[PDB]
Design an enzyme around this catalytic site. Structure first.
Site, PDB file in Angstrom:
ATOM      1  CB  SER A 172       3.997 -67.291 -66.073  1.00 32.65           C
ATOM      2  OG  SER A 172       4.297 -67.871 -67.346  1.00 32.65           O
ATOM      3  CB  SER A 173      -0.046 -71.037 -67.793  1.00 33.97           C
ATOM      4  OG  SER A 173      -1.248 -70.509 -67.276  1.00 33.97           O
ATOM      5  CB  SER A 199       4.518 -64.694 -71.591  1.00 36.82           C
ATOM      6  OG  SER A 199       4.503 -64.700 -70.175  1.00 36.82           O
ATOM      7  N   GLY A 200       1.645 -63.153 -70.646  1.00 34.13           N
ATOM      8  CA  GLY A 200       1.023 -61.975 -70.043  1.00 34.13           C
ATOM      9  C   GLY A 200      -0.021 -61.238 -70.887  1.00 34.13           C
ATOM     10  CD  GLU A 244       8.288 -68.344 -71.157  1.00 33.05           C
ATOM     11  OE1 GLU A 244       9.059 -69.253 -70.750  1.00 33.05           O
ATOM     12  OE2 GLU A 244       7.366 -67.856 -70.444  1.00 33.05           O
ATOM     13  CG  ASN A 298       1.502 -63.720 -66.287  1.00 31.81           C
ATOM     14  OD1 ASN A 298       1.038 -63.193 -65.262  1.00 31.81           O
ATOM     15  ND2 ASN A 298       0.746 -64.435 -67.150  1.00 31.81           N
ATOM     16  CB  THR A 313      -4.693 -67.932 -67.841  1.00 28.11           C
ATOM     17  OG1 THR A 313      -4.201 -69.238 -68.121  1.00 28.11           O
ATOM     18  CG2 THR A 313      -5.291 -67.995 -66.474  1.00 28.11           C
ATOM     19  N   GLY A 343       2.261 -69.040 -73.378  1.00 33.54           N
ATOM     20  CA  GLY A 343       2.453 -68.134 -74.493  1.00 33.54           C
ATOM     21  C   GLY A 343       3.883 -67.815 -74.858  1.00 33.54           C
TER      22      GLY A 343
HETATM   23  N1  LIG Z   1      -9.526 -59.121 -68.595  1.00 31.15           N
HETATM   24  C1  LIG Z   1      -8.676 -58.872 -67.581  1.00 31.15           C
HETATM   25  N2  LIG Z   1      -9.073 -58.160 -66.516  1.00 31.15           N
HETATM   26  C2  LIG Z   1      -8.258 -57.905 -65.487  1.00 31.15           C
HETATM   27  N3  LIG Z   1      -6.982 -58.325 -65.422  1.00 31.15           N
HETATM   28  C3  LIG Z   1      -6.450 -59.047 -66.433  1.00 31.15           C
HETATM   29  C4  LIG Z   1      -7.290 -59.378 -67.582  1.00 31.15           C
HETATM   30  N4  LIG Z   1      -6.527 -60.085 -68.412  1.00 31.15           N
HETATM   31  C5  LIG Z   1      -5.311 -60.213 -67.844  1.00 31.15           C
HETATM   32  N5  LIG Z   1      -5.265 -59.594 -66.659  1.00 31.15           N
HETATM   33  C6  LIG Z   1      -4.089 -59.475 -65.768  1.00 31.15           C
HETATM   34  O1  LIG Z   1      -2.900 -59.847 -66.477  1.00 31.15           O
HETATM   35  C7  LIG Z   1      -2.255 -60.928 -65.816  1.00 31.15           C
HETATM   36  C8  LIG Z   1      -1.770 -61.909 -66.867  1.00 31.15           C
HETATM   37  O2  LIG Z   1      -2.907 -62.507 -67.506  1.00 31.15           O
HETATM   38  P1  LIG Z   1      -2.865 -64.060 -67.915  1.00 31.15           P
HETATM   39  O3  LIG Z   1      -4.203 -64.490 -68.441  1.00 31.15           O
HETATM   40  O4  LIG Z   1      -2.271 -64.831 -66.772  1.00 31.15           O
HETATM   41  O5  LIG Z   1      -1.814 -64.011 -69.145  1.00 31.15           O
HETATM   42  P2  LIG Z   1      -1.313 -65.239 -70.073  1.00 31.15           P
HETATM   43  O6  LIG Z   1      -2.052 -66.414 -69.595  1.00 31.15           O
HETATM   44  O7  LIG Z   1      -1.750 -64.807 -71.431  1.00 31.15           O
HETATM   45  O8  LIG Z   1       0.197 -65.290 -69.952  1.00 31.15           O
HETATM   46  C9  LIG Z   1      -3.353 -61.527 -64.938  1.00 31.15           C
HETATM   47  O9  LIG Z   1      -2.890 -62.305 -63.831  1.00 31.15           O
HETATM   48  C10 LIG Z   1      -4.217 -60.358 -64.548  1.00 31.15           C
HETATM   49  O10 LIG Z   1      -3.592 -59.588 -63.528  1.00 31.15           O
HETATM   50  O1  VO4 Z   2       2.619 -65.926 -68.962  1.00 28.22           O
HETATM   51  V1  VO4 Z   2       1.464 -67.164 -69.866  1.00 28.22           V
HETATM   52  O2  VO4 Z   2       1.385 -67.072 -71.724  1.00 28.22           O
HETATM   53  O3  VO4 Z   2       2.643 -68.710 -69.834  1.00 28.22           O
HETATM   54  O4  VO4 Z   2       0.140 -67.826 -68.796  1.00 28.22           O
HETATM   55 MG   LIG Z   3      -1.947 -68.562 -68.633  1.00 27.94          MG
END
Ligand SMILES: Nc1ncnc2c1ncn2[C@@H]1O[C@H](COP(=O)(O)OP(=O)(O)O)[C@@H](O)[C@H]1O
Ligand code: VO4
Ligand SMILES: [Mg+2]
Length: 759
Positions: free
Chosen positions: A198-199, A149-150, A447, A195, A154, A445
């Site tokens: 978070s999705s 997560s984070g 968590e 996050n 996404t 992801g």
């Molecule tokens: N390549 C990137 N450039 C800028 N910010 C990013 C990038 N990747 C992630 N982030 C930041 O990190 C936060 C979490 O990313 P996200 O893709 O939502 O994580 P996950 O989906 O893996 O939980 C985003 O909302 C954004 O602020």
């Molecule tokens: O914080 V995520 O891996 O559910 O988008």
């Molecule tokens: Mg996501």
């Protein structure tokens, strides 16, 4: 010569071996002429001689070990290069700020048609490589984005979709595939402590193509929206973004019509954080009457990306871009506000009178607003929430039961709204037929929190299956191909996680089935379920009782109040209370009949021992996905979360090393150092140049023509290896291997021409 040795927070530190003893090494950390410390011999690693250099592919390192991998990724991160390869697999370290221009249209075009290696590591190169393989191999493709997560799954999923639509799109269908995502984030993403965005569902996004590799449309699959968040959140979390986008950004006309107010006024938002994401300027655009006392005191939440007011505007633009009229938009909002008002319907005991409960007098308006927005009769709703026909009579429900009925109805309405949204998105880019797809996978992801419930269990289960598919495709099948083709590649061993998946999904005695069995008992008990889990999995390496946790907060959880699953990504202690009721997806008939008979057409359309297993539904959905993934060529982007604080420029070595280990990337780097990521059969190569061969070449057996073609092309033979049926190319030779696969008749004749000359 300096070496890498353990460090509790940096992972490794650099020093010199100054003495050696029985089973240990003595290390003098650089620039600390005084101090030394001891390290086991198998924990010290050779280091690159230049400590400030980096390589784009970790395969090019002089010394290929976990310590050099860690350091190389760090040096790149420190220079705002968040992308690095291990051959054809991408590593992506979350920057937590926007690095200028690296996703611009200009950068997109610079990646087009380029081979891996000829441009810097980038998510754009992974996408391009999938489009090319699609075209040339005639084979649907999948890009798997993984990480906790984070980590950045996404954001990277959106970069891939953007690259593909901009580069290989029609030139209005594109945009639509891209604008779908912010729309789905509004309804399925939420602030958790890991996050801000978070999705809370998994997605598989398919871009479909015809015979000439042109985009014909798209398809979005969605997996297991988190239900409990619809109704309650921890104090640092929020409900789905849509609730706050609407409260912050709706016009006064809209707020009046839907009876919205500041988020503290709704039960379904106010156990959580009631603050908006906003910056100094956007704060001023939100009306005072939308702000909670918590917001007025503590100020806004800060984030580089999220802005509730600005995201409401963007979400409405996105709706208008994909084709929702203003009626569809208002319908979506109405159902959202109806769920909110539903949650304000509160109950007080009435044991001496009905034996059940009544609505609290204060809930009178909520009942009214709810009923109006959901097109139900106030009395019908009152009765469905406070009484229930049972076996024969019609019995008054206790306060706790009315709450459950209220919440179950809210969960189902919102869930059906989310389903409607995803379907509406697929309707904006349909297609009747297609030849191939490029699908991008973006799951919720891995968590864990201080308290982990059913939601975290389902989510980590899904991460478990994904990691297993990575193991299967990259660590297992790859080594099976090297062996089958007689390459003599040194075998690499790794810890596999199929036993963890079995614990969860095995028939009859898997956690999921044990839970299902519990739901079907006369007296369903979380405690009974949990005891049975421990009992049937004695001495299983992936299961433990809560009191064996490393965290003190878990020490007082009884054996029958939870369990630890030892996931590939780490131990997680689950508290099992509510597992049983959370595992049932079925809505009681009275509530179903109530909402299906709404006066409102749109709401009717949402809906076209009763027990439906959430766990086994999810399992069935994921197995079908996996079958689809297995039928494709797969590329992998491993996302890495650099720290626990959402800050830029804070590389936590031990945290990052831990993820490199758990993701299998240390094992992959080991296999790859002496592996062959590119290959194709002698015969198919020969058969492709055949019609251009003068008789002198055509007469050569397929294998010998290849040797000639490679020698004519300047190719060095350290760089490839002939197997039984295929020729194999080493890491760093993707450009050379692509020139050989190019099927363009001008290109084939040109290379044949070069072979003739060479003879
Ligand atoms: N390549 C990137 N450039 C800028 N910010 C990013 C990038 N990747 C992630 N982030 C930041 O990190 C936060 C979490 O990313 P996200 O893709 O939502 O994580 P996950 O989906 O893996 O939980 C985003 O909302 C954004 O602020
Ligand atoms: O914080 V995520 O891996 O559910 O988008
Ligand atoms: Mg996501």
């Amino acid at each position: 010569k300096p070496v890498w040795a353990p460090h509790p927070t940096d992972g490794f530190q650099v020093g010199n071996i100054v003495d050696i003893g029985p089973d240990s090494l003595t290390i003098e950390p650089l620039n600390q002429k005084g101090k030394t410390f001891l390290a086991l011999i198998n924990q010290v690693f050779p280091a690159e001689e230049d400590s400030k250099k980096d390589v784009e592919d970790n395969c090019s390192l002089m010394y290929l070990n976990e310590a050099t991998l860690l350091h190389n990724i760090k040096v790149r991160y420190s220079k705002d290069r968040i992308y690095t390869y291990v051959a054809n697999i991408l590593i992506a370290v979350n920057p937590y700020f926007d690095i200028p221009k690296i996703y611009s249209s200009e950068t997109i075009k610079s990646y087009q048609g380029k081979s891996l290696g000829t441009m810097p590591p980038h998510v754009f190169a992974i996408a391009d490589k999938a489009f090319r393989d699609m075209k040339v191999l005639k084979l649907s493709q999948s890009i798997i984005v993984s990480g906790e997560s984070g980590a950045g799954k996404t954001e990277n999923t959106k970069f891939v979709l953007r690259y593909l639509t901009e580069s290989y799109g029609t030139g209005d269908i594109d945009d639509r595939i891209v604008e779908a995502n912010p729309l789905l984030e509004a309804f399925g993403n939420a602030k958790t402590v890991r996050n801000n965005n978070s999705s809370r569902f998994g997605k598989f996004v398919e871009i479909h193509f015809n015979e000439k590799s042109s985009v014909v449309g798209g398809f979005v699959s969605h997996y297991l929206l988190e239900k409990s968040r619809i109704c309650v959140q921890g104090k640092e979390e929020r409900n789905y973004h849509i609730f706050y986008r609407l409260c912050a950004g709706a016009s006064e006309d809209i707020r009046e019509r839907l009876h919205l107010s500041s988020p503290d006024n709704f039960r379904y938002l106010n156990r959580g954080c009631t603050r908006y994401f906003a910056n100094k300027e956007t704060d001023k655009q939100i009306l005072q009457n939308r702000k909670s006392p918590e917001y007025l005191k503590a100020g806004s939440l800060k984030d580089p990306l999220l802005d509730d007011h600005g995201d409401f505007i963007r979400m409405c633009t996105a709706m208008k871009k994909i084709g929702l009229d203003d009626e569809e938009k208002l319908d979506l909002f109405r159902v959202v506000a109806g769920v909110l008002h539903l949650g304000n319907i509160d109950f007080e005991e009435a044991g001496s009178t009905s034996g059940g409960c009544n609505l609290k007098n204060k809930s009178t308006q909520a009942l009214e607003y709810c009923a109006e927005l959901l097109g139900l009769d106030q009395d019908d709703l009152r009765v469905s929430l406070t009484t229930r026909v049972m076996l024969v009579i019609k019995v008054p429900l206790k306060v706790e039961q009315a709450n459950n009925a209220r919440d179950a109805l809210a969960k189902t309405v919102y869930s059906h709204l989310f389903d409607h949204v995803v379907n509406r998105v697929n309707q904006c880019f349909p297609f009747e037929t297609s030849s191939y797809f490029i699908g991008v996978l973006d799951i919720a992801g891995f968590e864990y929190f201080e308290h982990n419930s059913f939601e975290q269990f389902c989510i980590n289960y899904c991460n478990e299956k994904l990691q297993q598919f990575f193991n299967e495709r990259i660590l297992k099948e790859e080594q099976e191909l090297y062996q089958k083709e007689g390459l003599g590649v040194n075998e690499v061993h790794y810890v596999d996680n199929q036993d963890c998946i079995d614990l969860i999904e095995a028939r009859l005695v898997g956690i999921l089935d044990i839970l299902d069995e519990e739901n079907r008992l006369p007296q369903p008990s979380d405690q009974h379920f949990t005891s049975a889990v421990h009992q049937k999995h004695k001495d299983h390496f992936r299961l433990s009782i809560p009191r064996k946790s490393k965290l003190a907060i878990h020490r007082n959880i009884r054996d029958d109040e939870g369990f630890i699953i030892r996931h590939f990504a780490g131990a997680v202690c689950y508290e099992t209370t509510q597992f049983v009721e959370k595992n049932n997806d079925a809505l009681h008939m009275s509530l179903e009949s109530l909402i299906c008979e709404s006066r409102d057409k749109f709401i009717r359309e949402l809906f076209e021992l009763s027990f439906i297993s959430v766990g086994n539904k999810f399992k069935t959905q994921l197995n079908l996905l996996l079958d689809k993934l297995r039928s494709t060529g797969a590329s992998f982007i491993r996302c890495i979360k650099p720290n626990l604080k959402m800050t830029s420029h804070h590389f936590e070595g031990a945290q990052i090393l831990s993820q490199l280990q758990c993701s299998g990337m240390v094992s992959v780097l080991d296999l790859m150092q002496g592996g062959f990521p590119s290959r194709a059969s002698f015969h198919e190569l020969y058969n492709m140049y055949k019609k251009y061969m003068p008789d002198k070449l055509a007469r050569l057996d397929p294998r010998l023509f290849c040797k000639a073609l490679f020698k004519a092309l300047g190719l060095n033979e350290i760089d490839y290896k002939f197997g039984l049926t295929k020729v194999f190319f080493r890491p760093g030779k993707f450009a050379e291997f692509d020139q050989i696969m190019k099927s363009d008749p001008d290109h084939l004749a040109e290379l044949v021409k070069r072979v003739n000359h060479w003879l």
